[PDB]
Ligand binder design. Structure first.
Ligand SMILES: O=C1CCCC2=C1C1(CCCCC1)N=C(Nc1nc3ccccc3o1)N2
Ligand SMILES: O=C(Nc1cccc(Cl)c1)C(F)(F)F
Ligand SMILES: OC[C@H]1O[C@@H](O)[C@H](O)[C@@H](O)[C@H]1O
Length: 390
């Protein structure tokens, strides 16, 4: 009864309704980009490391039509969007470029338009909707960016690569949302495939599509329903930090650095710095293993590596919060659970629990033993960016 069933036919319906009511015509176009859960490989992406996200059935739909007047008209119905629900603005030019500001939800769309690599980009009308809980750790921002991107490609096809559209979305996040993220979230919103995880090499940008066939094993995403103050603020600090180590170690990134190399170099770098690279360099290894373990389909070693990932993110990288520790520590003591850990950037958001679908009704009865409000998603590994024509 705390479990938010996804309703994706309802999400598109809602979207179509609101559009015809707002603008006076049936929309021509529907796109979706999903939210994500990162199964293992946390704070590795910007250290050119490995990440094992899968796409969620939680998503962000644009529905909309091209305009002859060169201007953009956005209406959002997302519950937690900041006022106003509606912004219009001329397309950028050589002369004027878009500026981030108010409302913030509109900055991600603006961002993508501002860096969209193709021309001529005509003006549009769009309703924006989302079942991705906003600031809940499941990449609402990447779903909206990649949803925008996808809608723009129908207006003006790009002659480019997935990485290029990921980078464009990532630039919008940096410039327009002030969030210096890596490419896991964008990549996965773009490239996810139903019943697969997506093993992303963030040095080479080689990708692997890893079957999650087995219908026994499932994944419980548990929303902590907190986004602590230090989240916004401590992400860039971590990055700056990782940068200095590589700087001091004559290493083009932490990817190339391996743990035997860091152990020796305790004193080349800071004490703070050393306890954090231990996570990155280590993390990178356990994402490889989890990868190789998933192919072998040892649901068990999922745990060792996934529970170890939390410990490392909590004790070493310091991007957990009591609420996460108590959802993780609560899950990892339940028979019928391979393992649990904070997912995405931390200081709040969701845990992810690899468990036997048989014990789903027991875990959701047990957790909601949590000192806070728990929201539950039972996540099929899902499709990436989708167009449907109306
Ligand atoms: O303030 C923060 C902290 C960082 C994470 C986060 C936010 C806010 C920014 C905008 C207003 C609500 C809160 N928004 C997202 N929004 C994401 N917002 C959407 C709105 C409509 C459709 C799809 C969307 O995806 N993420
Ligand atoms: O993770 C899953 N299954 C899984 C199966 C075998 C080994 C491991 Cl580590 C995982 C998922 F996504 F299907 F639920
Ligand atoms: O694993 C940490 C991740 O945090 C996400 O929220 C961020 O957007 C990703 O780029 C990655 O840094």
């Amino acid at each position: 009864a705390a479990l938010r069933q996804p309703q994706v036919a309802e999400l598109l319906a809602e979207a179509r309704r609101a559009f015809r009511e707002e603008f006076g015509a049936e929309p021509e176009l529907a796109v979706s980009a999903p939210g994500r859960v990162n199964l293992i490989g946390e704070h590795t992406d910007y250290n050119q490391g490995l990440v094992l996200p899968m796409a969620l059935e939680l998503m962000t739909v644009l529905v909309g039509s091209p305009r002859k007047d060169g201007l953009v008209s956005l209406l959002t119905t997302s519950e937690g969007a900041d006022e106003p629900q509606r912004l219009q603005f001329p397309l950028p030019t050589a002369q004027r470029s878009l500026e981030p500001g108010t409302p913030r939800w509109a900055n991600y769309v603006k961002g993508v338009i501002q860096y969209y690599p193709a021309a001529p980009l005509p003006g549009f009308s769009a309703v924006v909707v989302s079942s991705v809980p906003l600031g809940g750790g499941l990449s609402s921002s990447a779903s909206l960016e990649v949803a925008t991107y996808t809608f723009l490609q129908q207006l003006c096809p790009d002659s480019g690569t997935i990485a290029a559209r990921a980078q464009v979305c990532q630039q919008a996040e940096h410039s327009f949302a002030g969030m210096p993220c890596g490419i896991m979230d964008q990549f996965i919103s773009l490239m996810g495939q139903k019943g697969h995880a997506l093993l992303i090499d963030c040095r080479s940008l080689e990708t692997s599509l890893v079957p999650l066939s087995d219908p026994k094993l499932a994944v419980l995403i548990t929303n902590s329903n907190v986004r602590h103050s230090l989240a916004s603020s401590e992400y860039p600090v971590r990055r700056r930090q990782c940068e200095e180590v590589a700087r001091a170690l004559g290493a083009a990134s932490l990817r190339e650095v391996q743990l035997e190399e860091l152990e020796a170099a305790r004193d080349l770098v800071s004490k703070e710095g050393f306890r954090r690279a231990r996570h990155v360099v280590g993390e990178i290894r356990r994402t490889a293993q989890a990868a190789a373990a998933l192919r072998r389909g040892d649901y068990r070693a999922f745990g060792r590596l996934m529970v170890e990932s939390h410990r490392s993110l909590r004790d070493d990288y310091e991007v957990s919060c009591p609420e996460l520790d108590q959802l993780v520590e609560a899950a990892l003591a339940v028979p019928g659970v391979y393992g649990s850990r904070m997912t995405g950037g931390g200081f709040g958001g969701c845990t992810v629990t690899l468990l036997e679908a048989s014990a789903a009704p027991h875990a959701m009865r047990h957790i909601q033993h949590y000192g806070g409000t728990a929201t539950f998603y039972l996540s099929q590994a899902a499709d990436g960016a989708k167009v449907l024509c109306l």
